[PDB]
């Protein structure tokens, strides 16, 4: 997005990112940069140890034996990818990680969760992973030579609006990685076809004045509430409370049977 929304949302680096294309007759440093970009984006910005590097796959990429898409596929099918994104993760979290790493976006629909779940159950991890890389979406956006990059913050064709909002649930910042087993943030949002408010970068903070307590910190409590007292006006509720009233607010939410969806510093 433009700068004025980008600084607020903390997506300036994503907006100014340039797609990396491995051209013909590329030099050694270009292949090095392409390999580094693939490792950064497919492995979700983890500190990749040299012992976890795919030496044979990057050799084939260097020697023009395979394309960038094939190297992306080799990294995605690698046991390193399995260990940090599949073997200790629930299936819904795993496929949103696949969507972020391979297509650069958040899941659009619960049917996309229904897909890749049956596909896993019928054809294994390899077929399920190949679905993303062989998809029509991967071909027009990245092709055989462009490193995949995150696209959820920009308006795409055949895109649902929720994708942009849901993007901030899967991209938590430039200095973030997908490293810690964790559950998806999009489960209820995808299942019930909703959208969650975006609280990223500086968007989450709210005015404090003299209303915040001793340590001048407000917390936003997003809860799901029903009538258990006073009339409930909305199913969704947001509560801004100081630190000193955080335990009391939590306990009275608990005794009303209200489900807490999120707590963030505001």
């Amino acid at each position: 997005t433009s700068l004025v929304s980008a600084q607020r949302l903390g997506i300036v680096a994503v907006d100014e990112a340039i797609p990396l294309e491995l051209r013909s007759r590329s030099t050694e440093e270009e292949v090095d940069a392409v390999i580094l970009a693939v490792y950064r984006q497919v492995l979700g910005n983890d500190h990749l140890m040299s012992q976890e590097r795919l030496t044979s796959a990057e050799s084939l990429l260097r020697g023009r034996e395979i394309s960038v898409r094939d190297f992306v596929r080799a990294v995605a099918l690698s046991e390193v990818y399995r260990q940090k994104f599949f073997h200790s993760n629930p299936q819904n979290r795993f496929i949103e990680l696949n969507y972020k790493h391979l297509l650069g976006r958040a899941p659009y629909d619960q049917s996309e969760i229904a897909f890749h779940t049956d596909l896993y159950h019928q054809g294994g991890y390899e077929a399920e992973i190949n679905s993303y890389i062989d998809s029509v979406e991967y071909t027009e956006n990245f092709g055989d030579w462009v490193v995949p990059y995150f696209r959820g913050f920009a308006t795409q064709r055949n895109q649902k609006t929720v994708g942009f909002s849901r993007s901030f649930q899967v991209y938590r910042g430039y200095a973030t990685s997908d490293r810690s087993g964790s559950r998806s943030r999009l489960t209820r949002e995808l299942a019930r076809n909703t959208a969650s408010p975006v609280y990223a970068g500086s968007t989450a903070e709210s005015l404090r004045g003299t209303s915040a307590g001793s340590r001048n910190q407000m917390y936003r409590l997003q809860v799901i509430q029903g009538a258990a007292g006073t009339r409930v006006r909305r199913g969704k509720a947001e509560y801004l409370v100081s630190y000193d009233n955080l335990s009391a607010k939590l306990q009275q939410i608990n005794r009303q049977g209200d489900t807490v969806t999120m707590i963030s510093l505001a």
Partner: protein
């Protein structure tokens, strides 16, 4: 998505019963007015660029702070995004008009748009005002009596206006 027929179909399967005579006659009534629905879709489409541009000009005239430097419509990139959002909303309104159901408009366009605009800082009230101007314009083309067979399109006009109301409610 859902169209006017599949909505009744999905409700009937959940109840696990055949469509009754009344529902079948309601859908027969719906396909009786199918030609007017096609005309309205075609008429909005043929003047989509004029609808978007005239509504944007009116919106920037009534709200000069959008195009004022520092405004959210200032700079070519933001102005281009704004005109694209107007065209996008209009396109999805036509999609909902075509299908006879609002599912395409909600699921693909309207759901998540308020949060997106709040996160972007796009003024939802200004976008809602722009959608009313497109609504006002698009009903004038849809209700234009010149060069079309005479008939009563009040029902389809109300349906189109309802879709535009959903859009305006969603952005704000």
């Amino acid at each position: 998505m859902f169209d006017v027929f599949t909505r009744v179909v999905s409700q009937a399967d959940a109840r696990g019963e055949y469509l009754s005579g009344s529902q079948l006659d309601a859908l027969s009534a719906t396909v009786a007015e199918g030609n007017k629905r096609i005309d309205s879709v075609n008429r909005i489409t043929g003047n989509a660029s004029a609808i978007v541009s005239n509504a944007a000009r009116a919106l920037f005239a009534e709200q000069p702070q959008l195009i004022q430097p520092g405004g959210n419509a200032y700079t070519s990139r933001r102005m281009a995004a704004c005109l694209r959002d107007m065209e996008i909303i209009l396109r999805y309104v036509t999609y909902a008009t075509f299908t006879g159901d609002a599912s395409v408009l909600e699921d693909r366009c309207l759901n998540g748009l308020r949060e997106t605009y709040v996160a972007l800082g796009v003024p939802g009230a200004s976008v809602a005002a722009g959608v009313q101007k497109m609504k006002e314009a698009a009903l004038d083309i849809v209700n234009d009596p010149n060069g079309i067979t005479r008939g009563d399109c009040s029902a389809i006009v109300a349906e189109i206006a309802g879709y535009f109301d959903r859009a305006a409610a969603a952005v704000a």
